[PDB]
A paper describes a structure:
Glycinamide-RNase-transformylase T (PurT) is found only in some specific bacteria including Mtb and utilizes ATP-dependent ligation to catalyze the formylation of 5′-phosphoribosyl-glycinamide (GAR) in the third reaction of the de novo purine salvage pathway. Structural comparisons of MtbPurT using DALI Server indicated that it was structurally similar to the ATP-grasp fold proteins with their characteristic three domains, and thus MtbPurT is categorized as a member of the ATP-grasp superfamily as in the previous studies. According to the MtbPurT structure, the monomer of MtbPurT consists of a small lid domain and a large α/β domain. The B-domain forms a flexible lid and covers the active site for ATP binding.
Author numbering:
A (entry chain A): 27 to 110, 114 to 174, 181 to 188, 199 to 204, 212 to 352, 365 to 413
B (entry chain B): 27 to 111, 115 to 153, 169 to 174, 212 to 352, 365 to 413
The structure:
């Protein structure tokens, strides 16, 4: 059983450990020579993965049982070549293509599915912008298809590309991790507990699990998460990005790769997002049981700093090279778990 | 920060992962070419580890910050020289020597310390080869129990932590079965901590120690201690917040530890087809660790040890 990982960054390494515990040989592919998953993989490969010819030869020679796309820098055309009884793609070349095309994924979510999003318009003129502002009002979020905030410049109520978004009030950003595998009885679709996340003080990301939601908010979230994921199809672990304001839930995005916010799961769930995606790739049963509330801080290791960081109760750390590290804590409550993680991170950075 | 592992087998691999999560480069040393920790280590080394000359040159050239002895086939004479000259040993050489000398460890436990053991005699009943030959009186036993003792430094100096007792026994098809926690009476648990703590402090140094005991209601007997992660410790990979390997990674490096339990659990060490895993991972709260030339660990957790053992039985059965 041979799995091939397109991408060899930090989560590619943990996934590779996970897959090796379950008995699989892993090939780690990337562009440069010293990539993280190269060090512990069974076989390392260097190719400009953004090269449809060069990538496709590599896949034909090695001929892996499973082809896992863990990065965004990849030839989607090369992947559809391989799809077009020798290798299962997990995720599908469909999902890889849909989620790298930002325009097409929004239009898939809001138009084909009836998913609720923040009002958005794709323009291609100045005049197109002019209308939207008159129609939509302020503030707007003009973004290339950096992201400027058009916060200023209809007489009656009955009245390349650049993306315009109306701005909505938001309480929480939330990551819904959806897992699609096979069980001993066929297809499984599992939901993790909502993961709350946000940008923190020193340019770090903070996450925590579980984020509490109302019944109506949680029903909406499962519904939205489940529907975008079934449209993509195939086995895999999907991170579905949502915006929440009390009862309202908005679709923002989905990634076929383990999000930075998922790092909390390494300590807060029985099976981490990496153990889940190892099992999903290989078509094995999964559950989404939680160990305990937790929080994480992704920073972007002096001997003194480590000693101090691990002095914080129920804490853990994942050191990764230059400027990359994860601070982790668990606790009987999310609030304690976030305070401990901020302590771990503070003693570390 | 560079740790060197004497021994490169399956537990040496998990310890190596653990140490790499905490930021350390690991050198895996063993006798043969394809050893398990070689595959994911940062640097691999092949040497005859019982050769004091050959081993000692290897340690002098590489010059690691920490020297960890994970196997028993190692030159203790080569090891004592490293403590006499740049490099911290976890575990310490005193411990490596005492626990490989079976006669001297018994005499240390029963004579110098006043530890209770089964009556024993060395001559020159359970007659066993120790030359000398060891004679033991046979006592009634309820449970075999592993007491995992952890010695590290915290942010406030020395720590000595006890894990929850691990029960273990030989089960069917040659599998070793373990489970955590094993319930003990107050008097039994007081005895066990006392015995575990006393043999470990006599060895000294940082490390993770497995202390073997025999239990019959009230009475606790010392049977053995190892400076290496016992096969019965495998249950901790899922039953404790920090597995025996994460604890020994933290102990080697002198970091704080705790011994919190996630949930009751059980394990079965067997000594791997796709349908075997599909069927095996269908058991609730189950996990597997595949190695090896047939080596595998079946794991389950549950709200009760009894369910956790039945699930692990099932996982192992669907796997074997």
């Amino acid at each position: 059983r041979r799995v091939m990982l397109l991408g060899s960054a930090e989560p590619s390494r943990e996934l590779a450990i996970a897959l090796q515990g379950l008995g699989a040989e892993v090939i780690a592919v990337d562009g440069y020579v010293g990539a993280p998953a190269h060090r512990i993989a069974d076989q390392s490969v260097v190719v400009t993965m953004t090269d449809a010819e060069e990538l496709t030869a590599v896949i034909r020679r090695l001929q892996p049982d499973f082809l896992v796309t863990v990065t965004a820098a990849v030839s989607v055309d090369a992947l559809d070549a391989v799809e077009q009884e020798c290798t299962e793609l997990v995720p599908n070349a469909r999902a890889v293509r849909c989620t790298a095309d930002r325009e097409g994924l929004r239009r898939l979510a809001a138009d084909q599915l009836g998913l609720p999003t923040a009002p958005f318009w794709f323009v291609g003129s100045l005049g197109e912008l002019q209308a939207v502002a008159v129609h939509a009002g302020f503030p707007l979020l003009v973004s290339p298809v950096g992201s400027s905030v058009v916060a200023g410049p209809a007489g009656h109520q009955v009245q390349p590309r650049v993306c315009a978004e109306s701005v909505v009030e938001i309480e929480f950003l939330v990551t819904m991790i959806v897992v699609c595998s096979q069980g001993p009885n066929g297809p499984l679709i599992e939901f993790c507990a909502p993961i709350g996340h946000r940008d923190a003080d020193a340019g770090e990301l903070e996450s925590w699990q579980p984020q509490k939601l109302s019944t109506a908010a949680l029903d909406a979230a499962k519904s939205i998460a489940a529907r975008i994921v079934k449209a993509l199809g195939g086995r895999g672990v999907f991170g579905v990005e949502l915006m929440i304001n009390g009862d309202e839930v908005y679709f923002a995005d989905v990634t076929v790769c383990p999000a930075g916010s998922a790092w909390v799961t390494v300590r807060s769930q029985r099976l981490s997002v990496f153990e889940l995606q190892a099992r999903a790739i290989l078509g094995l049963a999964v559950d989404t049981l939680m160990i305990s509330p937790g929080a994480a801080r992704v920073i972007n290791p002096p001997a003194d700093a480590l000693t101090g960081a691990l002095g914080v109760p129920e804490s853990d750390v994942v050191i990764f090279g230059r400027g990359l590290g994860v601070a982790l804590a668990t606790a009987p409550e999310v609030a304690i778990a976030r305070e401990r993680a901020r302590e771990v991170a503070s003693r570390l950075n």
